[PDB]
Amino acid sequence: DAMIVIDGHGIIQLFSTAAERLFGWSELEAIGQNVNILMPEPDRSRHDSYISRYRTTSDPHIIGIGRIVTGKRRDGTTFPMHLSIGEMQSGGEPYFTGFVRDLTEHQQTQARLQEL
Numbered sequence: 001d002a003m004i005v006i007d008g009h010g011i012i013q014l015f016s017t018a019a020e021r022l023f024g025w026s027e028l029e030a031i032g033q034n035v036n037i038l039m040p041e042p043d044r045s046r047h048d049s050y051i052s053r054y055r056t057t058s059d060p061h062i063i064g065i066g067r068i069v070t071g072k073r074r075d076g077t078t079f080p081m082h083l084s085i086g087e088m089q090s091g092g093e094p095y096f097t098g099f100v101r102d103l104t105e106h107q108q109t110q111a112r113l114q115e116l
């Protein structure tokens with residue numbers, strides 16, 4: 001699905017077309033913004049520390065592990081998504097890449113089956 005690339009400060013560098021469809025923000029709008037704009041509180045207010053923490057401690061909590069989290073669209077609606085984060089480097093600087101898998105349908109089908 002969506003692909004997002006951020007620098008070591010959480011600023012969006014690349015935003016794929018699928019990402020635009022999934023999150024509602026366009027490439028130009030998202031580029032130059034903190035990745036925290038795609039998530040809700042409390043994570044939103046702590047995400048920077050999350051990244052900050054990893055840069056010194058070097059202890060992966062998600063990198064190479066993957067996790068299902070809640071994403072937030074521009075219109076404020078939240079949805080579940082699987083996220084895998086990869087670490088890379090360019091220009092001697094660190095970059096993080098996130099691969100997103102929308103699980104909205106999976107969750108809806110599950111809730112519906114649970115309801116019937």
Ligand code: HEM
Pocket residue numbers: 004005006035038039040043047050051054059060061062063069070071072083085096097098
């Ligand atoms: C939109 C939803 C997202 C949410 C809610 C989210 C949530 C989190 C959480 C909970 C942590 C801390 C994990 C822990 O303390 O165990 C974390 C760490 C991190 N996130 Fe995200 N994140 C999101 C998107 C992204 C994206 C798109 C990127 C990068 C392209 C990113 C990069 C990072 C990095 C680099 C870390 C630290 C590395 C690590 O702990 O393994 N996150 N995130």
